[PDB]
Design a protein around this ligand. Structure first.
Ligand SMILES: Nc1ncnc2c1ncn2[C@@H]1O[C@H](COP(=O)(O)OP(=O)(O)OP(=O)(O)O)[C@@H](O)[C@H]1O
Ligand SMILES: Nc1ncnc2c1ncn2[C@@H]1O[C@H](COP(=O)(O)OP(=O)(O)O)[C@@H](O)[C@H]1O
Lengths: 745, 225, 225
């Protein structure tokens, strides 16, 4: 039947439009903005605006949440479409708002809400429809209670809108728009896609899947930092698919009373048995299911045994899926890790700046932002926060903006005005102040992402870049050639050379090029992990790296292992041995199936333990040569962009007097010159503020900040204090080591 | 403390006043204007002489005092509750048909009262209206706080049993069933069962008393441009 | 529409017939149009006098009243709960033979009712056939909603004891249990112990009106090659 289309999300945000593939308009003779009648569940019929959208496939129909509710259908359902361009312009329509949103508004909806929303929008509407209108603070909803012409009519300038009357009580069938959907979650696209993949069949077609006779997954573990919306995600999925979602909290159950708490759990389970395929969500498992070492009393053992027996007996039964929320799987008792139990594992990472941007966009939908808001800037400045952090930031930013106008708003003694509310706008100063009175919670936590440093950010080392690309990109690009040749690619690549050459920058650049996750491990962290907590931390680090495959893991200050091992201390031998042995025993366990790469870097290749220098382990060795002249000029240009710019003294000349200088030293020189330029700017503003004391307000022409004109004075200061950070003895030692390797191998 | 006052003061005016009159008629009967011994509907006396002062007097009153108040109060409670329930749907803008059904029930029950020698025609009205209510919307699933098999056209035999254990004169619930089923047949089954010419013809004065209302358009504002 | 109709059509044929008989008995008794002179269960006519006038009225005419209401209700719950197991006793096939020895059970129990002077031959036959079906596969326990682990195959005896202690009219069920044990022994002994031209031929008239149903081949399909 060429009229059944699978429902899909609409990129268009209009509540009265539909997006179709081009052959749909070709076959169905549809014009732009055509009113087409639709069919679906509950025998719900309405019309919308036909819009061309080739993005959706022929069977795919793009159509948003509000019209989905109007049709009483869920995602993945097939609908029927029929053209009906015989609509007529509305003349007089009586509409009313639903009661349970109007609470405390005291305003005219017609001008504040209806007039701008329905400004000759030509929206095809029908009697008994439900729709939502955004507001400065709330998202109200209205229902068409009386139409002329009936039942279908079109928004026209001659539309006598009867907008005043008794608020409409809830239709007693809910279908409220207050629920949470996929659109309400930001920064979890991959995980959301995975869940939507492996939840579909057990919940949508239980009869068909049961008739197939395949055991579905039953145990899913969402784990991550607290306050990241995991419960929100579960509730949104349950609302989207439609089930008998039941929530259980840890403390509310474990500290119930005596020993009857188990019954409650049993109660929960039996209810699912009477309530179709349903979702069972349980929160804070570690609070009730810790490791047996932490278990000091006896009752907890009984609780854990009872829950294990209850959940393991869930074979067949019904199409009921159970998932749990926790923070660290390490804190969880391993006995709840077998097959048939929780086996599916999903982690929710900390969102990047972009994810923060979508979260802010979601949370600021109602707010009337002024024309000074740079959401991207805030997202950049808010690294280390979470969704709850951003929600609180938005809430108290709006609160600050409102409180700044206590004088403006009549304090009065009843429900506040709506027009005054609509007049409020949010300034960027409010957001800045909210940032000032704020603090994140994640902070000291490892972040996994794709770095931003590109190739051109570092000059020179063209052969090095080519070698790295050859070693990394092609084996994963063309595994077929390796299979034909029967070859295993190398994985352990080590860097050795003078310190300060931006080796970390090279790692970031190559990770960015490969477009994969990046994980950084520092020598400080390693030495912290020396005494005591070493094995578990290394194991979980590699587990996380394998989880985020493909990814690049980095190591720094490796020689520091020997520094406390052999040196003025000579006492960290046990911890160093533990760390080195853990690293060696775990890294070789990596399988070629995992697309994870390992990079090591050090500046003291002599002291490195020879055991690492073994095939399968770190074998590829790349020296780090110093930039020379044109390479130095390229690095200076790369560091020169920033913001200031002044081509008044030959930069190549200054590069040529600074031969044999490390890149870090050159960057230091550039920053010193920048500080001198800031000193000059401070001199300018100081003379301004001094001489307009002499002449009262002596600011008639605009005396701007000095244009970047960094003079040879600053560079002469830089060369006056010029540090050859690289030491010639160490350079000779590096060359000796390189030649020893070249002659030996 | 008297939450009875709070519950009564939240009642809609039309239903509160109609139900207040409905429950005040038994109070007038209980006061003693006409003795309960003077309410028996003698067949031969009504046949020969007028005695038109007590054909319906005992129907709208029940001899309830401080000995059996529980049953009377729960019956009136469910009476008002079902009144509002039927006010919700259908009779949301058409009270004329609602009053037509009430007076139809009363005419049928008083015809039966004239015909036969029953005495207390108050519970019979309960079966009449309750069955016509439960059968106007048959084939639906509803449950109370502990509903086991609470279902349409099944409460009549429930009250059959409850009146058998507590009460008598079984014919009353039979007549309530008969009137409810006759009305239900007249609603849906009759038009395509026995041809046509439906007998739902409201007399002019009955419609004059309580006609069906109409939704007002109210004030409107042109959208303009 | 009435869900009662298809609910009763869901009842299997044997329980269909029994339910029809046991619901027609009260209605026929309470009709009042037919002369009761044919139907009084008069002991003098049936015991001493030959009185071919009323040889079969015992099971049809029956003074229904509040004499066995509680026991009849508990048996109604039992049948409502377990009629599926009730109807499936070793006689899905040859159901004409099933009705044959059920009529034989009727004739033996009415012989008992002629020799003995009990009160009602209604419970004993049904309880006896149900319990003989149970005894052929005896001793798997069962319990109702609140029954935690209460043992089965005592329910006939639980009812016997409850009737014996409080109330009356329990002797007929136990004499029916005795005659049912006699029937249980006979169905094994009589057919093979003695011959006698296998008594008489079972009439085919009952097959003429209500035939039994056997295997149907439907239609086949050519295998080919
Ligand atoms: N992906 C997200 N999209 C939108 N808002 C989010 C997101 N993640 C978090 N938030 C916001 O931060 C809050 C944190 O979630 P919430 O506290 O409700 O539950 P949770 O993180 O699943 O855990 P818990 O039940 O332990 O609190 C959310 O209520 C929401 O306001
Ligand atoms: N394009 C570049 N080329 C060379 N060096 C750079 C470049 N950009 C920054 N640097 C310098 O490199 C330093 C970081 O080098 P690092 O990775 O720590 O080397 P190492 O680990 O050998 O000390 C920074 O201090 C910075 O000044």
């Amino acid at each position: 039947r060429p009229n059944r289309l699978i429902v899909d999300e609409a990129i268009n945000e209009d509540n009265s439009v539909v997006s179709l593939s081009q052959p749909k308009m070709d076959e169905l003779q549809l014009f732009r903005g055509d009113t087409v009648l639709l069919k679906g569940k509950k025998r719900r019929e309405a019309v919308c605006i036909v819009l061309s959208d080739d993005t959706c496939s022929d069977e795919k129909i793009r159509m948003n949440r509000v019209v989905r509710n109007n049709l009483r259908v869920r995602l993945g359902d097939v609908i029927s479409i029929q053209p009906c361009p015989d609509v007529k312009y509305g003349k007089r329509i009586h509409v009313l708002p639903i009661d349970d949103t109007v609470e405390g508004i005291t305003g005219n909806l017609f001008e504040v809400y209806l007039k701008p929303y329905f400004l000759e929008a030509y929206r095809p509407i029908r009697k008994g429809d439900i729709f939502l209108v955004r507001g400065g603070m709330r998202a109200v909803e209205f229902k068409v209670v009386e139409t002329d012409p009936s039942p279908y009519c079109i928004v026209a300038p001659d539309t006598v809108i009867h907008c005043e009357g008794e608020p409409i009580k809830r239709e007693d069938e809910e279908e409220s728009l207050n629920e949470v959907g996929y659109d309400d979650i930001g920064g979890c696209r991959k995980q959301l896609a995975q869940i939507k993949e492996m939840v579909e069949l057990p919940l949508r077609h239980p009869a068909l899947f049961k008739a197939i006779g395949v055991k579905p997954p039953r145990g899913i573990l969402l784990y991550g930092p607290p306050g990241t919306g995991k419960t929100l995600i579960a509730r949104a999925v349950a609302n989207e698919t439609g089930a008998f979602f039941f929530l259980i909290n840890g403390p509310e159950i474990m500290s119930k009373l005596a020993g009857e708490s188990e019954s409650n759990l049993r109660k929960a389970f039996e209810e699912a048995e009477k309530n179709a395929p349903a979702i069972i969500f349980i929160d804070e498992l570690d609070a009730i299911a810790p490791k047996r070492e932490k278990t000091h009393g006896e009752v907890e053992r009984r609780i854990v045994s009872q829950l294990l027996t209850l959940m393991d007996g869930l074979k067949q039964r019904a199409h009921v899926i159970v998932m749990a929320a926790t923070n660290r799987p390490n804190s969880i008792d391993p006995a709840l890790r077998r097959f048939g139990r929780f086996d599916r594992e999903v982690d929710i990472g900390i969102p990047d700046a972009t994810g923060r941007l979508e979260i802010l966009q979601i949370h600021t939908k109602n707010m009337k932002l002024a024309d000074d808001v740079d959401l991207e800037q805030v997202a950049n400045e808010t690294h280390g926060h979470v969704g709850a952090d951003l929600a609180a930031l938005c809430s108290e930013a709006a609160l600050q903006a409102i409180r700044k106008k206590m004088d403006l708003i009549d304090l009065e003694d009843e429900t506040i005005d709506a027009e005054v509310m609509n007049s409020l706008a949010v300034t960027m100063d409010d957001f800045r102040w909210a940032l000032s009175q704020s603090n994140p919670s994640a902070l000291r936590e490892t972040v996994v992402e794709v770095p931003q440093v590109t190739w051109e950010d570092i000059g020179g080392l063209e052969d090095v870049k080519r070698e790295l690309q050859e070693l990394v990109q092609y084996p994963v690009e063309h595994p077929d050639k390796f299979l034909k040749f029967g070859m295993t690619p190398s994985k352990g690549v080590l860097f050795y050379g003078p310190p300060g050459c931006g080796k970390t920058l090279l790692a970031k650049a190559i990770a960015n090029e490969c477009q994969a996750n990046f994980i950084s491990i520092k020598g400080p962290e390693l030495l912290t992990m020396w005494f005591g907590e070493s094995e578990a931390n290394v194991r979980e680090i590699f587990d996380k790296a394998r989880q985020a495959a493909p990814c690049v893991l980095f190591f720094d200050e490796l020689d520091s292992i020997a520094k406390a091992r052999g040196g003025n201390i000579g006492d960290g031998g046990g911890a160093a041995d533990r760390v080195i042995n853990q690293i060696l025993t775990e890294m070789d366990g990596m399988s070629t199936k995992k697309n994870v790469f390992i990079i090591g870097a050090t500046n003291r290749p002599d002291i490195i333990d020879p055991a690492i220098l073994r095939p399968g382990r770190l074998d590829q060795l790349i020296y780090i040569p110093l930039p020379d002249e044109k390479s130095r000029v390229a690095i200076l240009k790369a560091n020169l962009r920033k913001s200031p710019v002044a081509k008044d003294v030959d930069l190549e000349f200054l590069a040529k007097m600074t031969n044999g200088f490390s890149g870090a030293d050159l960057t230091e020189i550039c920053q010193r010159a920048c500080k001198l330029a800031i000193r000059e700017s401070i001199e300018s503003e100081i003379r301004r503020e001094r001489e307009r004391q002499t002449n009262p307000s002596a600011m008639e022409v605009e005396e701007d900040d000095p244009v970047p004109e960094i003079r040879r004075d600053h560079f002469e200061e830089a060369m006056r204090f010029a540090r050859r950070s690289v030491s010639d003895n160490d350079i000779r030692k590096y060359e000796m080591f390189a030649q020893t390797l070249q002659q030996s191998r | 403390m008297s939450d009875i006052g709070d519950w009564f003061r939240s009642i809609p005016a039309i239903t509160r006043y109609w139900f207040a009159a409905t429950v005040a008629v038994p109070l007038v009967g209980k006061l003693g204007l006409i003795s309960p011994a003077y309410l028996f509907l003698w067949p031969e006396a009504f046949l020969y002489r007028f005695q038109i002062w007590r054909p319906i007097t005992a129907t709208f009153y029940f001899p309830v005092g401080p000995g059996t108040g529980f049953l009377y109060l729960v019956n009136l409670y469910f009476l008002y509750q079902y009144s509002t329930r039927l006010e919700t749907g259908a009779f949301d803008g058409r009270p004329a048909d609602y009053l037509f059904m009430l007076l139809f029930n009363w005419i049928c029950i008083v015809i039966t009262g004239l015909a036969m020698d029953m005495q207390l025609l108050m519970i019979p009205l309960i079966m009449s209206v309750l069955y016509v209510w439960a059968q106007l919307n048959r084939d639906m699933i509803v449950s109370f706080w502990f509903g086991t098999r609470f279902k349409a056209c099944y409460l009549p035999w429930v009250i059959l049993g409850f009146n058998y254990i507590i009460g008598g004169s079984v014919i009353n619930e039979l007549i309530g069933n008969l009137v409810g089923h006759l009305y239900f047949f007249l609603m849906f089954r009759y038009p395509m069962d026995l041809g046509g010419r439906n007998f739902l013809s409201t007399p002019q004065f009955l419609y004059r008393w309580l006609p069906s209302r109409r939704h007002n358009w109210g004030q409107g504002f042109r959208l303009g441009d």
